[PDB]
Design a binder for this molecule. Structure first.
Ligand SMILES: *[C@@H]1O[C@H](CO)[C@@H](O)[C@H](O)[C@H]1NC(C)=O
Ligand SMILES: *[C@@H]1O[C@H](CO)[C@@H](O)[C@H](O)[C@H]1NC(C)=O
Ligand SMILES: *[C@@H]1O[C@H](CO)[C@@H](O)[C@H](O)[C@H]1NC(C)=O
Ligand SMILES: *[C@@H]1O[C@H](CO)[C@@H](O)[C@H](O)[C@H]1NC(C)=O
Ligand SMILES: *[C@@H]1O[C@H](CO)[C@@H](O)[C@H](O)[C@H]1NC(C)=O
Ligand SMILES: *[C@@H]1O[C@H](CO)[C@@H](O)[C@H](O)[C@H]1NC(C)=O
Ligand SMILES: *[C@@H]1O[C@H](CO)[C@@H](O)[C@H](O)[C@H]1NC(C)=O
Ligand SMILES: *[C@@H]1O[C@H](CO)[C@@H](O)[C@H](O)[C@H]1NC(C)=O
Ligand SMILES: *[C@@H]1O[C@H](CO)[C@@H](O)[C@H](O)[C@H]1NC(C)=O
Ligand SMILES: *[C@@H]1O[C@H](CO)[C@@H](O)[C@H](O)[C@H]1NC(C)=O
Ligand SMILES: *[C@@H]1O[C@H](CO)[C@@H](O)[C@H](O)[C@H]1NC(C)=O
Ligand SMILES: *[C@@H]1O[C@H](CO)[C@@H](O)[C@H](O)[C@H]1NC(C)=O
Ligand SMILES: *[C@@H]1O[C@H](CO)[C@@H](O)[C@H](O)[C@H]1NC(C)=O
Ligand SMILES: *[C@@H]1O[C@H](CO)[C@@H](O)[C@H](O)[C@H]1NC(C)=O
Ligand SMILES: *[C@@H]1O[C@H](CO)[C@@H](O)[C@H](O)[C@H]1NC(C)=O
Ligand SMILES: *[C@@H]1O[C@H](CO)[C@@H](O)[C@H](O)[C@H]1NC(C)=O
Ligand SMILES: *[C@@H]1O[C@H](CO)[C@@H](O)[C@H](O)[C@H]1NC(C)=O
Ligand SMILES: *[C@@H]1O[C@H](CO)[C@@H](O)[C@H](O)[C@H]1NC(C)=O
Ligand SMILES: *[C@@H]1O[C@H](CO)[C@@H](O)[C@H](O)[C@H]1NC(C)=O
Ligand SMILES: *[C@@H]1O[C@H](CO)[C@@H](O)[C@H](O)[C@H]1NC(C)=O
Ligand SMILES: *[C@@H]1O[C@H](CO)[C@@H](O)[C@H](O)[C@H]1NC(C)=O
Ligand SMILES: *[C@@H]1O[C@H](CO)[C@@H](O)[C@H](O)[C@H]1NC(C)=O
Ligand SMILES: *[C@@H]1O[C@H](CO)[C@@H](O)[C@H](O)[C@H]1NC(C)=O
Ligand SMILES: *[C@@H]1O[C@H](CO)[C@@H](O)[C@H](O)[C@H]1NC(C)=O
Lengths: 344, 344, 344
């Protein structure tokens, strides 16, 4: 750089109060989560019970801010053969009576007690449906609560960052009530704008209101300005000074205004050369270090189950029919032989 | 303002060391989530596996801090009619045998294989109950984990805000090891209280302990003090000075103590008027901008299912009975005719 | 402390530009959650719909940054007794016909309509399985989303803390464009290293690049240095000075270099004693107040259900058999009597 250029250097001034305000404390922002999250749907209050005791410690942080007898005997034999036949028929039909009734008893057993199986399975199935739907409903609510929860946590983080700004600004308030009040700071546009004379401190709800009695340049000039000059391979350093003309005569003044005092030997300092030392750059950087998230595919497929299956539950188990008898020609010929028997 | 008032202005001093401490670094607070979240219930460790790799990158941020033959033939015909009748009866009862046994075979089919249907449905229903209860249990755990998780995330946010305060305070430490150590700062109650002479820097675990050799006013006076005076519609500005009396004679002194030097022309600066310039107010404010959350009603009713339904599962399907035969008068009259047949 | 020691005090200087950079603003880091959370698995986008409107307000904060007739008649009576017997048999077998067919009708009723019960229960059971597996899948996804969500919320918190550092650093930029530009700050190694002469401000994308024309000590000496001396139980205070020798003769100089001006009476100030005032320690501390989390055992066992149960669903309800008739000796003797009847 090194070059002579021009800085507005003040000529005539004026009084100037400043009256700046800088906050020092914070309200105890005890924010209820149950109100910020939840407005209605008492269900939400039933589920945020299960969400920890997060709001307590959250507001703990926020609080910590602030020849023819042959016929007779033979057909008598035949009649006792018919006697054999009909006692035989009584045997058959008694067996049929007990077994057809036993299979009907098994039928009643199945019907009654298998209705009871239907009743048990149907009640269990309805309760499965009920609690499945409770799971569905509350799970959707939990999605919504979790998003709204991290929004609230962002609210609290925003609040804490404000609390940190307020703490550092109160440190600046303590430093200014040191220097501006209990001293006359020789710093341009600090302790209010212009050149500080005295400051008047006064309180506020959460601030410290300053009343800086200062003075500002009412009148000046765009005037030439040189940091250092190199006559002889040889630099010149104005102690508490800046190289200035009067219309082309090199003088050195104060910075605050110019009564252009002549170049002495004492106020100038000298280097044996005019060799610039190059300085270091680029401070105040911070690395965030929030590094990386991979896919859902990696994250999921480490820890995941697909896990489905249908049933079978055949039902052709039912589907086999009942064959029947519908014959009655036996009854027909039976009663027609009964006609024949009453005939002769 | 502008008015003459009174500031304690120092008279006699005393030596004063200060010995302040300002931290510069932080411990590597590698906080395990599995310990801060989880203390017991290995179940919790089974579920926090599924909770991402959040704790890794979380501690990455925290790490980045640091004639009578008629009879014979006719009744022989009738006897063969009875032969027809009993072969006919054999036909009927064989049909009944096969069909009653077939309906019993269908009954055994239903009983065996429909027990197998009950076994399949009951095992599936128990597994439905099992995994439903796993869902219920782990879902409640997930509520609790999510609340405790955001409490941990608040812990980390609190920690990072401390890290930011430490970084800015270490910037102040670098600035004070510049000015207090390598210079004699002309700043009241900076570089320790009082007026700095020299500071002695020394290390600490995570701080830089200063030893500010300063000097403080042991003796002073509540004494009158004026910023500027307006004789002639015309202001007066003491350069490095403050208007002071000796008991009513206007002098201007240093701020640091008063040897009340007389009003010169050079130390006073003058405005042509006494016109206050009014200054700007109210800096250092930040807008949080955390704006808004609506109801659960809006948020929910965009994306929600109620979604319930019962079954029917009739059971009168069972409830139709089995009619029976319980008659035996046929057997009674049958064996009584058998008595009659053995009679004659 | 109080002791005479040695500070490098400058002798000959050199010009030195500094060229430091301090950022003042931030890019509008409108970070999409749907990209930072979600990369693939459109399912994830189906579930993050249910996760509030968190990303909107999240980026609202981030945006707010920037003889043989006896025989005839008697056996005619017996023949009508057989007529009674076979009409009686017709009665029995008609009753058996209707009842065996009725129990078969009940069997068909059970088979058809109980297949319909199996169909209803099986379809409901498959849908239970389906939506249970949807619950399982999406619940695991919600674990993963919640962990990745708080990682994103940590990203945003990290970003906001950077925004606070940038706001305070821009306050330092405003203070340096006050003092370094519009003044000549008498502060060592502030407004760039060395001793400030003038600074040249120039813009940047998000910074304010300074060009501090300063001057640094090219040449100096480790030289003795005393804060205060106690001849007579009586201290000595060099105003804008430091006690210095020339090779053992006590002088007081400037801090910036040494032309060792003689000890006057005016530049030294005096205490009547040599009594050190001890100062206060250990500022800039903040209490985090993130206090406490108890066990899962406390947190859980306040609000938790274990809640399991099996079924019974007997199945011996089926398991009772069907007894049968398999007899046919009646048919055998029946047709053998039919042989006997056709004989005679
Ligand atoms: C400014 O600096 C130049 C050298 O760059 C010098 O020759 C000149 O005399 C200086 N003054 C003016 C008024 O240009
Ligand atoms: C010179 O004065 C003008 C007045 O209009 C103002 O722009 C500024 O003070 C100076 N101009 C420059 C530095 O370009
Ligand atoms: C600067 O110096 C004198 C005295 O201040 C002034 O009168 C004159 O106009 C200027 N120029 C010179 C001496 O060349
Ligand atoms: C640098 O120091 C030496 C030491 O005697 C002195 O002779 C010389 O004048 C100094 N240089 C300047 C420019 O003052
Ligand atoms: C300052 O440092 C950052 C580090 O990321 C770099 O990107 C930037 O280019 C540097 N500034 C200049 C002017 O090179
Ligand atoms: C297995 O999981 C993947 C993961 O997206 C998904 O497509 C589906 O639920 C399952 N089945 C198949 C065939 O991918
Ligand atoms: C009725 O009987 C059989 C038994 O094997 C069954 O499979 C089928 O459905 C029916 N038979 C027909 C319709 O011919
Ligand atoms: C059947 O025969 C009997 C005698 O065997 C006699 O009463 C009559 O002729 C017939 N009818 C009735 C109804 O008895
Ligand atoms: C204070 O200011 C008033 C004007 O407000 C002036 O008359 C007076 O002389 C000053 N001094 C004292 C000691 O009151
Ligand atoms: C005047 O001195 C008293 C001493 O008790 C003290 O309150 C303060 O220094 C002054 N009082 C004021 C300014 O009200
Ligand atoms: C203030 O000035 C003189 C000299 O310091 C002092 O003796 C006198 O008492 C004071 N008052 C006057 C001169 O009215
Ligand atoms: C203001 O500047 C003019 C310019 O010559 C000068 O005459 C006047 O004395 C100045 N005013 C004061 C109060 O110094
Ligand atoms: C400072 O600005 C804030 C902006 O919200 C305002 O509320 C407050 O009233 C201002 N201060 C004064 C003293 O008016
Ligand atoms: C539909 O959802 C609402 C939402 O609170 C709730 O009352 C219930 O689960 C459902 N039914 C009715 C009738 O509101
Ligand atoms: C048994 O039979 C009928 C079949 O239609 C059934 O509905 C009913 O329960 C029973 N009848 C009675 C008890 O009269
Ligand atoms: C039945 O009649 C037979 C001959 O027809 C004869 O043995 C007896 O009288 C009766 N009883 C028995 C048991 O046979
Ligand atoms: C340093 O201080 C001691 C007293 O501690 C004093 O006797 C001595 O003369 C001083 N100077 C040197 C050069 O040691
Ligand atoms: C004295 O000079 C040496 C030069 O090597 C350097 O270590 C430092 O400036 C001084 N040494 C100290 C203070 O121990
Ligand atoms: C310090 O003072 C004189 C004059 O600066 C110097 O010549 C001498 O060497 C020193 N020592 C004394 C006077 O003992
Ligand atoms: C302290 O103040 C008194 C008041 O007159 C004065 O006599 C004495 O000299 C002062 N002490 C010092 C060391 O100046
Ligand atoms: C500073 O205060 C903290 C408060 O926790 C304390 O632990 C520490 O020991 C103090 N420093 C010293 C040097 O005692
Ligand atoms: C009850 O809950 C506990 C909690 O860990 C767990 O062991 C299990 O799920 C249940 N049963 C028993 C016997 O503990
Ligand atoms: C078949 O009949 C009975 C009915 O009580 C049933 O309990 C059992 O399983 C069978 N009886 C046997 C195998 O003896
Ligand atoms: C049975 O007897 C009838 C007459 O009663 C006669 O036709 C024959 O002898 C026998 N066989 C058949 C097939 O009728």
């Amino acid at each position: 750089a090194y070059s002579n250029n021009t800085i507005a250097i003040p000529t005539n001034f004026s009084i100037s109060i400043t009256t700046e305000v800088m906050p020092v404390s914070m309200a105890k922002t005890s924010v209820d989560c149950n109100m910020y999250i939840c407005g209605d749907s008492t269900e939400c209050a039933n589920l945020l019970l299960q969400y920890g005791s997060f709001c307590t410690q959250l507001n703990r942080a926020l609080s910590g801010i602030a020849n023819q007898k042959q016929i007779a005997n033979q057909f008598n034999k035949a009649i006792s053969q018919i006697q054999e036949s009909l006692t035989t028929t009584s045997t058959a039909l008694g067996k049929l009576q007990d077994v057809v009734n036993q299979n009907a008893q098994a039928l009643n057993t199945l019907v009654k007690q298998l209705s009871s199986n239907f009743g048990a399975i149907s009640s269990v199935l309805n309760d499965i449906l009920s609690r499945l739907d409770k799971v569905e409903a509350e799970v959707q609510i939990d999605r919504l609560i979790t998003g709204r929860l991290q929004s609230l946590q962002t609210y609290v983080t925003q609040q804490l960052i404000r609390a940190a700004e307020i703490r550092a600004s109160a440190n600046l308030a303590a430093t200014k009530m040191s220097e501006c009040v209990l001293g006359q700071s020789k710093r341009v546009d600090f302790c209010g704008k212009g050149y500080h004379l005295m400051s008047f401190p006064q309180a506020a709800p959460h601030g410290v209101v300053f009343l800086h009695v200062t003075y500002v340049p009412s009148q000046e000039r765009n005037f030439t300005t040189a940091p250092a000059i190199c006559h002889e391979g040889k630099a010149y350093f104005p102690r508490e000074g800046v190289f200035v003309f009067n219309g082309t005569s090199w003088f050195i003044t104060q910075r605050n205004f110019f009564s252009p005092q002549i170049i002495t030997t004492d106020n100038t300092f000298v280097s044996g050369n005019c060799d610039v030392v190059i300085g270091i750059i680029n401070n105040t950087v911070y690395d965030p270090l929030q590094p990386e998230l991979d896919s859902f595919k990696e994250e999921l497929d480490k820890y995941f189950k697909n896990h489905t299956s249908p049933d079978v539950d055949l039902g052709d188990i039912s589907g086999i029919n009942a064959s029947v008898v519908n014959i009655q020609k036996e009854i027909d010929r039976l009663n027609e032989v009964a006609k024949n028997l009453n005939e002769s």
